[PDB]
Amino acid sequence: MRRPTPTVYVGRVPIGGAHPIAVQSMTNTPTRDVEATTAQVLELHRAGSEIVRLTVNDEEAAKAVPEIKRRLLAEGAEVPLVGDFHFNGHLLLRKYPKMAEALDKFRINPGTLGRGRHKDEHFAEMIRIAMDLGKPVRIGANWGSLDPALLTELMDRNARRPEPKSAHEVVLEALVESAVRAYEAALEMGLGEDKLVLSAKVSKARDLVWVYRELARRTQAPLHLGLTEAGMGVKGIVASAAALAPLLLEGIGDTIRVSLTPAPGEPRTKEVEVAQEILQALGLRAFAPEVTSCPGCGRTTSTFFQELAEEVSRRLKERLPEWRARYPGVEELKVAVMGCVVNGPGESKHAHIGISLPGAGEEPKAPVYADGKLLTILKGEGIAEEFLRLVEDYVKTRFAP
Amino acid sequence: MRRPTPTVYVGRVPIGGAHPIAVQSMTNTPTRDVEATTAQVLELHRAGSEIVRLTVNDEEAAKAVPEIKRRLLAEGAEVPLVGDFHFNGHLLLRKYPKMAEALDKFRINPGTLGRGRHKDEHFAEMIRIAMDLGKPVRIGANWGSLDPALLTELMDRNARRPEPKSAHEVVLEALVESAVRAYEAALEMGLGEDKLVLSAKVSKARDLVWVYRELARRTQAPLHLGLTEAGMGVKGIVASAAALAPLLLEGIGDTIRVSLTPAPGEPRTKEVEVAQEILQALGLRAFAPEVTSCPGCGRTTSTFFQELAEEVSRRLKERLPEWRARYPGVEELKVAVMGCVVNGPGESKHAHIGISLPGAGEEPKAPVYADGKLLTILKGEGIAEEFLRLVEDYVKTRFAP
Numbered sequence A, B: 001m002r003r004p005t006p007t008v009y010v011g012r013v014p015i016g017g018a019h020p021i022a023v024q025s026m027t028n029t030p031t032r033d034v035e036a037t038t039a040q041v042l043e044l045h046r047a048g049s050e051i052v053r054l055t056v057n058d059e060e061a062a063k064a065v066p067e068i069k070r071r072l073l074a075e076g077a078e079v080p081l082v083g084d085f086h087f088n089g090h091l092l093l094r095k096y097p098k099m100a101e102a103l104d105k106f107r108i109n110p111g112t113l114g115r116g117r118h119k120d121e122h123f124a125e126m127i128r129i130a131m132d133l134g135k136p137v138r139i140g141a142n143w144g145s146l147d148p149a150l151l152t153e154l155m156d157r158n159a160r161r162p163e164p165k166s167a168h169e170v171v172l173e174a175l176v177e178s179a180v181r182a183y184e185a186a187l188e189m190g191l192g193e194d195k196l197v198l199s200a201k202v203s204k205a206r207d208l209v210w211v212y213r214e215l216a217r218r219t220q221a222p223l224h225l226g227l228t229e230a231g232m233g234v235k236g237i238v239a240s241a242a243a244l245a246p247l248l249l250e251g252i253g254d255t256i257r258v259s260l261t262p263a264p265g266e267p268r269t270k271e272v273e274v275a276q277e278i279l280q281a282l283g284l285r286a287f288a289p290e291v292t293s294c295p296g297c298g299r300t301t302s303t304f305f306q307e308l309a310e311e312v313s314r315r316l317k318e319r320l321p322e323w324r325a326r327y328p329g330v331e332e333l334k335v336a337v338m339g340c341v342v343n344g345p346g347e348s349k350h351a352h353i354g355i356s357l358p359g360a361g362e363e364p365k366a367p368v369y370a371d372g373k374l375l376t377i378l379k380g381e382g383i384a385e386e387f388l389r390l391v392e393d394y395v396k397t398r399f400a401p
């Protein structure tokens, strides 16, 4: 069901309907701080951010970008950099051509170009520079910065309707129109279809689904999908997954970014982890082995079961760097850890390998299944260590080169 | 878009297309431990579990249920109880009529009824008892416990097809068929449409969407929706949201349960919180005020912004018990906390009330918007306390009785 699109290369990373959905992220360090920004770019890339965006907000930020890129290259890190421009993007790209050349993509917001007539000039200048340098561009609209003139135009169109739509609905129409008009304008100026990505972000999940369905229908471009301003903690994680899934399941979206607010002291890499989990939950990409486990109920002994599931998950995460190097395809591994006979055997049989613990009323033994059939039955002390040895043995055989 | 269904009352809680989607959960204490189970039922109910399920797995569990119910009633807690039966449900309901009468709903799994001919007898006996006592029933299939005879029947049907489907696809067909056949059988026996809820759970999100679309098409019943065995931590949360959202957005589902594995020492109420967050993210129910905040970038000072967003979220959660009592509709409150001028004002204008902090290059002042227009501009020390006073003032006026 994947929506076909042309391919847009962001550095070495291809984005589009023929390619895996790419995970990206954005730094939160001051871009002018070269050491801090370089470190975080590397951190995010190592966590799985295939593309990294950084704000290029003033002259000091712009002068730093070439040095950041140089440092990344010096350690063989080929992570593409997207420059986020607002208000003065045309001035910065004009004045600092080394920055323009160092970036792998430019982000333009059609709502932060300036006022009235100046918008069109500023937009054209940035597209001109991208064309001269062979750079791709994201035209990214956001409802936090919606073009007010376009909003009035569409409010007037709506008022003329036999049955006018709500103000809220018109805001969404205008956001879509902002992206689509700027898309069409960039194409008319000669920027190639292989150099244009679009986004039109809102902060409410049901609205995001409406917007992206319209974008997908009305344009041919690959789409950068995300729920903007998703927020903190569990709310942010849930809202982001809830917003993206209906679209990704329908085949809409070519790159994603999860816009979480970090808690103080929480790593910026959390958003990368969440993005990966969304794609893997929907079977669109595989990044690491996953554990299926039941919630546990009154049929299990809660703490032993919870401890085993946690220990198995912890070991898989410890083994992954090595496994990824030795065992191609191991990212697809499914392990089950289950609490009793009700669903334990059946769920374990659906995993590559799973263990079903004895619950209430059962004999104190734990069947282990692999590839849908009984492998062995464990008992006594060290169930956990015996199981993890069996998982290691399984991986060696199943995912051998 | 909500799928119409008859109403099924679970105690005082109506489930169906005419009613709010109900959040439920399940205990993990041994049901025989009356003190522990009663406490957790109350804990879950207080967290927002409108219905609570408990395993009734043996005779000791069954004898405990009437006392649990008595204790709940003694504190005016009207929380409906669902009894989860496997293997011996027919024996327990027969032998312990006080338990049968004390429960507000019976859960039957058509894959844990027994072997061959005995299945039909056991099923009929449980439905007989529900009918005699006027109790509703969930017929809940789970792929961890799929009826093997039905699976063979459908494997044979599939082998006769001009183009046979995959084994995996046939497993899903069989799961649906298990629920649908048992549904039809219960109706034919005289159990009313106002007494039947269906579920057919799998552990993979894209498969769950397929299954529930089939269930929704082929039956008229309200549906209990959940991703079974979702797992631990972020994986579990993301998988659950990703699986449910496409269905809930399409109007499918009448009650949900989130099947998270608690980390050792993590409260059982986490699943209730996640369930509520899924429904609120999709605009289907409102439980508590929510904070929209940006991720922060190099345009903000990371820690001040993150600290303010966290402090605002913490205060809203502290004020809620009181607010819920005084200010009807306050559950719908949207507050924004934003990092700079790029999206700060616009996003704040979409919330009921929001603050936009000064980012890089800006004057050190923080505009506050309420109902889409400028309310005031804050500066200096105590921005956080001044903002929270403004939020209190706003709530008093907006959500006054």
Ligand SMILES: C#CCCOP(=O)(O)OP(=O)(O)O
Residues within 6 Å of the ligand: A084, A140, A141, A142, A199, A201, A226, A227, A228, A229, A257, A259, B294, B295, B296, B297, B343
């Ligand atoms: C830049 C910035 C703040 C908002 O980031 P976002 O990824 O949520 O939205 P975007 O910048 O509109 O793509």
Ligand SMILES: C#CCCOP(=O)(O)OP(=O)(O)O
Residues within 6 Å of the ligand: A294, A295, A296, A297, A343, B084, B140, B141, B142, B199, B201, B226, B227, B228, B229, B257, B259
């Ligand atoms: C009971 C039990 C273990 C699985 O619980 P679940 O809510 O994920 O699935 P269900 O019992 O099939 O409704």
Ligand code: F3S
Residues within 6 Å of the ligand: A294, A295, A296, A297, A298, A299, A300, A338, A339, A340, A341, A342, A343, A344, A359
């Ligand atoms: S939730 Fe309960 S039914 Fe068994 S497989 Fe897990 S212990």
Ligand code: F3S
Residues within 6 Å of the ligand: B294, B295, B296, B297, B298, B299, B300, B338, B339, B340, B341, B342, B343, B344, B359
């Ligand atoms: S993410 Fe950055 S652009 Fe401004 S509103 Fe938030 S600081």
